[PDB]
């Protein structure tokens, strides 16, 4: 379920530090700009 | 370190569709601009 | 919080096949 | 991939204390108890 996985990802994002979000953002940008 | 959480998030992005990544991006922008 | 991580884990268990849940169960058993 | 998610979950178990793993174990019993 993409809805279920997205919910889990959202919960986990809040446990990441600002520096970690750089890498998440980069992965997103490589997929959808 | 946050490396376990970052690993899990990065792994799970591969289970999400392109349209789902937009929501992750919004949550990142909410925090770091 | 650690609680937020726990709830993410619980949600992800619903994505796993029975055989992968056995693997998780075994790791938990060896820890506790 | 189910194995992809499995290894994500395994990494996250390292962020949990033994006390928290009890709830994970109980959830697993709801899903594959007796199997
Ligand atoms: Ca938000």
Residue numbers in the entry:
A (entry chain B), B (entry chain A): 212 to 244
C (entry chain C): 212 to 243
D (entry chain D): 212 to 246
What text appears in the publication on this structure?
CFAP410 is a bimodular protein comprising two folded domains, i.e. NTD and CTD, which are connected through a variable unstructured loop. All these three crystal structures show a similar homotetrameric arrangement, with each monomer consisting of two α helices that form an open nutcracker-like conformation. Two CTDs first form an intercalated homodimer, and two such dimers further assemble into a tetramer by packing head-to-head through their first helices.
The CTD truncations that finally generated well-diffracting crystals were fragments covering residues 256–295, 212–246 and 213–246 of H. sapiens, T. brucei and C. reinhardtii CFAP410 proteins, respectively. However, those of TbCFAP410 and CrCFAP410 only partially dissolved in the buffer. We, therefore, carried out refolding for the insoluble polypeptides using the following protocol. CrCFAP410-CTD was crystallized in a condition containing 0.02 M CaCl2, 0.1 M sodium acetate (pH 5.0) and 30% (v/v) 2-methyl-2,4-pentanediol at 4°C. Those of HsCFAP410-CTD and CrCFAP410-CTD were determined subsequently by molecular replacement using the crystal structure of TbCFAP410-CTD as a search template. Our data demonstrated that the wild-type protein formed a tetramer as revealed in the crystal structure, but mutant A219E became a dimer. Surprisingly, mutant L224P completely disrupted the oligomeric structure and formed only a monomer.
